[PDB]
Design an enzyme around this catalytic site. Structure first.
Site, PDB file in Angstrom:
ATOM      1  N   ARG A 252       4.100 -35.665  45.546  1.00  0.00           N
ATOM      2  CA  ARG A 252       4.657 -34.311  45.540  1.00  0.00           C
ATOM      3  C   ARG A 252       4.908 -33.781  46.951  1.00  0.00           C
ATOM      4  NH1 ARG A 252      -1.286 -33.646  43.489  1.00  0.00           N
ATOM      5  NH2 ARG A 252      -1.076 -32.821  41.352  1.00  0.00           N
ATOM      6  N   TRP A 261      -2.641 -21.997  50.263  1.00  0.00           N
ATOM      7  CA  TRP A 261      -4.063 -22.305  50.099  1.00  0.00           C
ATOM      8  C   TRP A 261      -4.866 -21.966  51.354  1.00  0.00           C
ATOM      9  CZ3 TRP A 261      -3.089 -23.848  45.275  1.00  0.00           C
ATOM     10  CH2 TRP A 261      -4.148 -24.267  44.455  1.00  0.00           C
ATOM     11  N   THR A 389     -14.232 -35.065  43.439  1.00  0.00           N
ATOM     12  CA  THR A 389     -12.775 -35.237  43.341  1.00  0.00           C
ATOM     13  C   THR A 389     -11.987 -33.907  43.277  1.00  0.00           C
ATOM     14  OG1 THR A 389     -12.666 -35.345  40.923  1.00  0.00           O
ATOM     15  CG2 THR A 389     -13.123 -37.408  42.082  1.00  0.00           C
ATOM     16  N   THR A 390     -12.671 -32.769  43.143  1.00  0.00           N
ATOM     17  CA  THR A 390     -12.004 -31.460  43.317  1.00  0.00           C
ATOM     18  C   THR A 390     -11.528 -31.314  44.756  1.00  0.00           C
ATOM     19  OG1 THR A 390     -13.992 -30.210  43.972  1.00  0.00           O
ATOM     20  CG2 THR A 390     -13.546 -30.405  41.624  1.00  0.00           C
ATOM     21  N   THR A 391     -12.135 -32.125  45.627  1.00  0.00           N
ATOM     22  CA  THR A 391     -11.997 -32.116  47.086  1.00  0.00           C
ATOM     23  C   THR A 391     -12.663 -30.903  47.739  1.00  0.00           C
ATOM     24  OG1 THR A 391      -9.910 -30.875  47.338  1.00  0.00           O
ATOM     25  CG2 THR A 391      -9.721 -33.229  46.815  1.00  0.00           C
ATOM     26  N   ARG A 429     -13.659 -27.267  39.195  1.00  0.00           N
ATOM     27  CA  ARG A 429     -13.674 -28.387  38.250  1.00  0.00           C
ATOM     28  C   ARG A 429     -13.387 -27.928  36.816  1.00  0.00           C
ATOM     29  NH1 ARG A 429     -12.280 -32.886  39.262  1.00  0.00           N
ATOM     30  NH2 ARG A 429     -10.744 -31.905  37.876  1.00  0.00           N
ATOM     31  N   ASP A 432      -9.861 -26.257  36.199  1.00  0.00           N
ATOM     32  CA  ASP A 432      -8.809 -27.258  36.262  1.00  0.00           C
ATOM     33  C   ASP A 432      -8.821 -28.143  35.013  1.00  0.00           C
ATOM     34  OD1 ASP A 432      -6.830 -29.156  37.982  1.00  0.00           O
ATOM     35  OD2 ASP A 432      -8.442 -30.379  37.122  1.00  0.00           O
ATOM     36  N   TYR A 508      -4.649 -20.872  38.615  1.00  0.00           N
ATOM     37  CA  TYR A 508      -4.714 -21.343  37.242  1.00  0.00           C
ATOM     38  C   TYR A 508      -4.760 -20.194  36.245  1.00  0.00           C
ATOM     39  CZ  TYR A 508      -5.454 -26.078  38.968  1.00  0.00           C
ATOM     40  OH  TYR A 508      -5.287 -27.311  39.558  1.00  0.00           O
ATOM     41  N   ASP A 513      -1.202 -25.269  35.155  1.00  0.00           N
ATOM     42  CA  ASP A 513      -1.331 -25.692  36.550  1.00  0.00           C
ATOM     43  C   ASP A 513      -0.262 -25.038  37.425  1.00  0.00           C
ATOM     44  OD1 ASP A 513      -1.950 -26.946  38.960  1.00  0.00           O
ATOM     45  OD2 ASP A 513      -1.874 -28.990  38.169  1.00  0.00           O
ATOM     46  N   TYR A 515      -0.327 -25.341  40.872  1.00  0.00           N
ATOM     47  CA  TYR A 515      -0.101 -26.151  42.065  1.00  0.00           C
ATOM     48  C   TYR A 515       0.934 -27.252  41.799  1.00  0.00           C
ATOM     49  CZ  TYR A 515      -0.766 -29.310  45.988  1.00  0.00           C
ATOM     50  OH  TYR A 515      -0.559 -30.134  47.071  1.00  0.00           O
TER      51      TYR A 515
HETATM   52  C1  LIG Z   1      -8.555 -29.932  42.279  1.00  0.00           C
HETATM   53  C2  LIG Z   1      -7.567 -28.975  42.882  1.00  0.00           C
HETATM   54  C3  LIG Z   1      -6.821 -28.030  41.999  1.00  0.00           C
HETATM   55  C4  LIG Z   1      -7.321 -28.940  44.202  1.00  0.00           C
HETATM   56  C5  LIG Z   1      -6.307 -27.957  44.755  1.00  0.00           C
HETATM   57  C6  LIG Z   1      -6.160 -28.078  46.268  1.00  0.00           C
HETATM   58  C7  LIG Z   1      -5.894 -29.543  46.525  1.00  0.00           C
HETATM   59  C8  LIG Z   1      -6.842 -30.356  47.355  1.00  0.00           C
HETATM   60  C9  LIG Z   1      -4.808 -30.128  46.007  1.00  0.00           C
HETATM   61  C10 LIG Z   1      -4.582 -31.597  46.259  1.00  0.00           C
HETATM   62  C11 LIG Z   1      -3.875 -32.244  45.071  1.00  0.00           C
HETATM   63  C12 LIG Z   1      -4.630 -32.144  43.761  1.00  0.00           C
HETATM   64  C13 LIG Z   1      -6.131 -32.220  43.700  1.00  0.00           C
HETATM   65  C14 LIG Z   1      -3.910 -32.017  42.634  1.00  0.00           C
HETATM   66  C15 LIG Z   1      -4.553 -31.929  41.273  1.00  0.00           C
HETATM   67  O1  LIG Z   1      -3.989 -32.970  40.466  1.00  0.00           O
HETATM   68  P1  LIG Z   1      -4.986 -34.044  39.783  1.00  0.00           P
HETATM   69  O2  LIG Z   1      -4.918 -33.871  38.284  1.00  0.00           O
HETATM   70  O3  LIG Z   1      -4.747 -35.420  40.371  1.00  0.00           O
HETATM   71  O4  LIG Z   1      -6.383 -33.457  40.345  1.00  0.00           O
HETATM   72  P2  LIG Z   1      -7.822 -33.781  39.697  1.00  0.00           P
HETATM   73  O5  LIG Z   1      -7.927 -35.286  39.795  1.00  0.00           O
HETATM   74  O6  LIG Z   1      -8.782 -33.017  40.581  1.00  0.00           O
HETATM   75  O7  LIG Z   1      -7.725 -33.252  38.283  1.00  0.00           O
HETATM   76 MG   LIG Z   2      -2.713 -35.913  40.400  1.00  0.00          MG
HETATM   77 MG   LIG Z   3      -6.629 -32.400  36.714  1.00  0.00          MG
END
Ligand SMILES: CC(C)=CCC/C(C)=C/CC/C(C)=C/COP(=O)(O)OP(=O)(O)O
Ligand SMILES: [Mg+2]
Ligand SMILES: [Mg+2]
Ligand SMILES: [Mg+2]
Length: 536
Positions: A252, A261, A389-391, A429, A432, A508, A513, A515
């Site tokens: 993306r 952000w 993995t939310t980062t 988490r 999302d 959200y 979603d 983003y």
């Molecule tokens: C988690 C979140 C909303 C972060 C927002 C800020 C950020 C670091 C965005 C980076 C890309 C991301 C995590 C997209 C979610 O898609 P995905 O479905 O691949 O993410 P997931 O694996 O966390 O569900």
């Molecule tokens: Mg993704």
């Molecule tokens: Mg997700």
């Protein structure tokens, strides 16, 4: 052999942010008047012999106008004195405002201030249903409660139903304020977003309005905006000169949304270096996510993961050509960060963000393994992996890099996963997972959060989503407690974590979603903060 087909939409902005040239004579004109207006406003705050109610409305107004960052000492001194005097003999309006302001600033004021407004049941007297300003301030206060504040259990349901009932017959702009609050409370909103609304839609249209404050707020918003557009322009040029748009086409193009952000975490001038560093990290980790999620095979994702752990340019050749691109851009980014911080002897702190990034990548790789195998773990085990993995552990760490006052002891606190950071991550988490459950279930994600919840507890999709909603509510109570004094680190380092939780809630909102699909939620926000000035 391989790979998937592309379904992500392109940057809806094109190049409209790539070139911004500050009108230097205007910037200097705004700053000239703001100095004058700033001091008039200081002397309003330091006026002796104001009523309790008048002082609190002053402070509330300066905060919603978005100019309170100018007066942090003044506001604090005043609330500290209010906290230590125990004044309450007041009405619902003043009491609820007093409770909210003190708690937001960490002052652990007792929730017994509300007992006089309740019967013998801890349920609010229905005779208050005709007092709209009281209900509005009670509504806003109910969002700041903790686990020790169960006396306030009824306050959200009570104020909501009666504000809904009164709203259509209210005068303007009060009606617009009530209607907006019901959509988005102050406490959980993004500060620049709420400030834009309040200045333009509300305060500008109040008949009671203070002209000095309004002009102060308008000039200040528009001046900071020039800073933000410069930042975005320079980040857009960095992203363009990377050119992943043409060489890594599976990912993306969302650099503008990443800047939004970063601006949500802090908007003030003193954090400009911090914002630029943060947005570069957000956009890069987003590409890595799409590599695990949308392109790479299980073999080459294992090679990518081990290279990230070893962190060494010598490792590039063990990687597919297309992974060499991102991997090198990643190692280069942290070498850049080190050089920028070399001037204040803060290069050593970079290692903290790096270790947090290795952790994110390990868990991306686990999540992938679960997908191939079709494994639906226990909610316990799912969380142990899916929180990182939310980062959010990693963005929080990264937000400190560009803050000139972050010490090594501040990074050590954060490294132990304190409770306020764990709650912010939990909110991200579960929200999302609730918002994107169907999206993923359609394309085979057995390991989706809600699905683990359903299989584990033996419950419907409705009941699963409501247990997650409830985990988010508990998490907000823990954030709110985490702000109360005495704080474990300085408040300057707590606010970024709180603001991360706010970004989730705004992005959200209403449950899809924002983003991935920016035109939903984010487009109007980005236009209001970064395209259109407030008209003077
Ligand atoms: C988690 C979140 C909303 C972060 C927002 C800020 C950020 C670091 C965005 C980076 C890309 C991301 C995590 C997209 C979610 O898609 P995905 O479905 O691949 O993410 P997931 O694996 O966390 O569900
Ligand atoms: Mg993704
Ligand atoms: Mg997700
Ligand atoms: Mg992903």
């Amino acid at each position: 052999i391989v790979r998937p087909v592309a379904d992500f939409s392109p940057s809806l902005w094109g190049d409209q942010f790539l070139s911004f040239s500050i009108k230097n004579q205007v910037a200097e004109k705004y700053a000239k008047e703001i100095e004058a207006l700033k001091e008039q406003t200081r002397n309003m705050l330091l006026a002796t012999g104001m009523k309790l109610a008048d002082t609190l409305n002053l402070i509330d107004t300066i905060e919603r106008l978005g100019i309170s960052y100018h007066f942090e000492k003044e506001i604090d001194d005043i609330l500290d004195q209010i906290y230590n005097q125990n004044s309450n003999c007041n009405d619902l309006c003043t009491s609820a405002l007093q409770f909210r302001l003190l708690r937001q600033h960490g002052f652990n004021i007792s929730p017994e201030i509300f007992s006089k407004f309740q019967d013998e049941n801890g349920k609010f007297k229905e005779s208050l249903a005709s007092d709209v300003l009281g209900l509005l301030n009670l509504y806003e206060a109910s969002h700041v409660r903790t686990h020790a504040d169960d006396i306030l259990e009824d306050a959200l349901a009570f104020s909501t139903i009666h504000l809904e009932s009164a709203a259509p017959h209210l005068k303007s702009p009060l009606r617009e304020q009530v209607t907006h609050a019901l959509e988005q409370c102050l406490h959980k909103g993004v500060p620049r977003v709420e400030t834009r609304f309040f200045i333009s839609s509300i305060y500008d249209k109040e008949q009671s309005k203070n002209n000095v404050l309004l002009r102060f707020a308008k000039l200040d918003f528009n001046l900071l905006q020039m800073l933000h557009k410069q930042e975005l322009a320079q980040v857009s040029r960095w992203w363009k000169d990377l050119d992943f748009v043409t060489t890594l086409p599976y990912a993306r193009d969302r650099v503008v949304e990443c800047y939004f952000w970063a601006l949500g975490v802090y908007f003030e001038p003193q954090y400009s270096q911090a914002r630029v560093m943060l947005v570069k990290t957000i956009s890069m980790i987003s590409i890595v996510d799409d590599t695990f999620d949308a392109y790479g095979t299980v073999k080459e994702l294992e090679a990518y993961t081990d290279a990230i752990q070893r962190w060494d340019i010598n490792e590039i050749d063990r990687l597919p050509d297309y992974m060499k691109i991102s991997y090198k851009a990643i190692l280069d980014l942290y070498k850049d960060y080190e050089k920028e911080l070399s001037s204040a002897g803060r290069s050593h702190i970079v290692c903290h963000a790096i270790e947090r990034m290795k952790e994110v990548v390990r868990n991306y790789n686990v999540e992938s393994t679960w997908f191939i195998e079709g494994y639906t773990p226990p909610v316990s085990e799912y969380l142990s992996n899916a929180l990182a993995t939310t980062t959010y552990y990693y963005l929080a760490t990264t937000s400190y890099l560009g803050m000139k006052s972050a010490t090594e002891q501040d990074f050590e606190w954060l490294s132990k996963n304190p409770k306020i950071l764990e709650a912010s991550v939990i909110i991200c988490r579960v929200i999302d997972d609730t918002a994107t459950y169907e999206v993923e279930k359609s394309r085979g994600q057995i390991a989706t959060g809600i699905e683990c919840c359903m299989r584990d507890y033996g419950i419907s999709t409705k009941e699963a989503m409501a247990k997650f909603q409830n985990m988010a509510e508990t998490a907000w109570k823990d954030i709110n407690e985490g702000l109360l004094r005495p704080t474990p680190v300085s408040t300057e380092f707590l606010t970024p974590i709180l603001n991360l939780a706010r970004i989730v809630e705004v992005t959200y909102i209403h449950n899809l979603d924002g983003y991935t699909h920016p035109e939903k939620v984010l487009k109007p926000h980005i236009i209001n903060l970064l395209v259109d000035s407030i008209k003077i």
